Amino acid sequence: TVRKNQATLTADEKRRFVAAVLELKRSGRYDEFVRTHNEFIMSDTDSGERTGHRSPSFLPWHRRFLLDFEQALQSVDSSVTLPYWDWSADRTVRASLWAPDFLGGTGRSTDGRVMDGPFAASTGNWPINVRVDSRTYLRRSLGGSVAELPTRAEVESVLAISAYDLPPYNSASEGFRNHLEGWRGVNLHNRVHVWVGGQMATGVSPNDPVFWLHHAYVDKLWAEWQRRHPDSAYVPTGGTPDVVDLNETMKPWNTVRPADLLDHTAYYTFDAL
Template sequence: MAIRKDANTLSTAERAEFVAAVHELKRTGIYDQFVLRHANANMRAIHRSPAFLPWHRRYIWDFEQELQRVSGNPNLGLPYWNWPEGGANASMWDDDLLGGNGDVGTQIVNRGPFRASQWTIVSSSGAPAGPLTRNFGSQGWAQTLPTLDEIEQVLALTPYDVSPWNEFVNTGFRNQLEGFDGPNLHNRGHGWVAGSMLPMTSPNDPIFFMHHCMVDKLWHEWQLRFPNQGYLPVSGAAFGQNLTDPMAATNATPIGPRPLDVLDSSALNIQYDQLLAGTLPPPSTQPDIIALTIGSPVDASISIPGEEDLYSFEVPAFGSYTIETTGPSDTFMTLFGPDNPNQQIAANDDGGQGLNSRISQTLAAGTYLVHIRLYSPNSTGNYTIGVESNAVDTTIPDINVDGPAINAAISVGRESDLYHFRIDNQGTYTVETEGSTDTFLTLLGPDDQTAEIAMDDDSGMFLNSRIRAQLTPGEYFARVRHYSDFGTGPYSVSVHSG
């Protein structure tokens, strides 16, 4: 497993390996493709919004994978810029790693492996745009780097984000880590380096990737400190920001493109060399997990403000299940699994009766974890929680390849319809919907109902979905839902070759 280390602690050999891999990516044009991916993404889709952290986690993970590929070392980890120890005199700025500041006046970097004679940046169109520039501490709003006290101040914040999910919110972890409120962490790093690190083409400077590795490290530590605080929003925000929306400029392979797909650092084999002293809580603070039995509700209560109750239950077979609370309290529910306590599936506030929570979901066999808290962190109250198996036909309809389309409908909000088809011969196949309903389509397989191949919203006619992909022989699944959480309507779905 690759371990991401403080850039200041890299050995001479590790520095040389990192620099050589970055230069090889530059030589082959892959590095510049990363610059363009960031520069040409919709700015508000990847900044000033909840997806800021998952988008950049996936982005630097992809970059790390490329470093490993060209170096031939699967254990090469992306170094991080430890801001409190990373000022102008830090060893990471030595000539064997990043070089240093730009020259006075021109700001051009003329030292180290990314000096003007060795490194050319590109514009957002991909055209050569001259040498790399830096101007440490020149911006009035970013004359110093974040301190450990400022980092700890932000790491203490919950929840992850709040409505209206933008740069103007004055509570929540994401916006303060990004830097539009509070002590200004991420934004200040860009501003302190200045020069090429200021525009959307900032990945031109390799420090960008170390900088965002530090940002990701802090999100990772926040997740460890608050394991019961999931990603928000689950739904209701602009497309690309919700938990299960595909993010902008993000491929569906080799891992999924949604915030949901990158929430668990361990699943991505991300490991950091060290964590801050306050990150790992003592074991005694971990709450007990109460086992639920399907069909047998349990009475419970939040007796201390801010308390969160944890429950587990076993799903014996693929099917439709409802987890809900009843009673006088305003509950908030989050569901994780299967067999992964860190993989958030869904969350709900008032989907049940009154102010109660309800999640109705098609679930695969496995173990699931439910977190229950009260909507107000200052409240206490009683509630009852139960899990029920819904009396529905869970047989997955078959689609015949090159056969007639199946007529169906999204009849209730948040309904998700699953279909099966078999591919006997390798080739190009198209899965698509038709009709007047704004559908969202996910293709899964082969031989795995959870392995996402591709997702699509409006590539078909009008508001219909269409996925065209190269498929090998095997069993595949197509999942159809409405683009809107609350939308309903008829549609047809088909699979054809070519």
């Protein structure tokens, strides 16, 4: 029940995590996670109903989404937990995260095909099934579409924002949530998806295992923000059309509200907050 920095994992933890992920893929359970995220990424609009992205519920939604995935991983190997990627610290293509014994590196120039690691197409263990871009191999272009990943200083400026979110509660919004998501400002979360490239830059981003480590860190940043602003909390808090209010139930589950996911300690803790 402790999410650790991917950089701190032992060779054993890394082995077990990879094996559990590959088994969810083999059993066909993994692909359904990819499908769910794309469905929400395609229907979440600034003009209408938005639940998973560009709205205040972007955080509790991905929090529950990651909880589901982690629970699925634990059904395979109860010792595995979702590690996180601090892209502000481990910002180079040579981070241990991108080594052949963990996630593998960047793609080759010609077609962006990842050639090493346990998820390279050549292993026959990571078929890209849920997709839009017809190709079926994992693709990446680390730092190809955007020069740099966010820095600690930049993350600090976003964490400083006291307002959780602000009307019109969408991609035009000011406030912590939209700045963390990245639609406005120095851009944190969105820029990271772009930096990795490949499937990570698309709606079927969960096709890349790094998607989970990336969102595990975004999730931690929300935890760090709550620590900085104990006086601040989730908004809106009542009758706001097309937006999930604090005590409103969230799709696709419907049995959970942002109010139930505010405190992460009910499900897990971090190596350090």
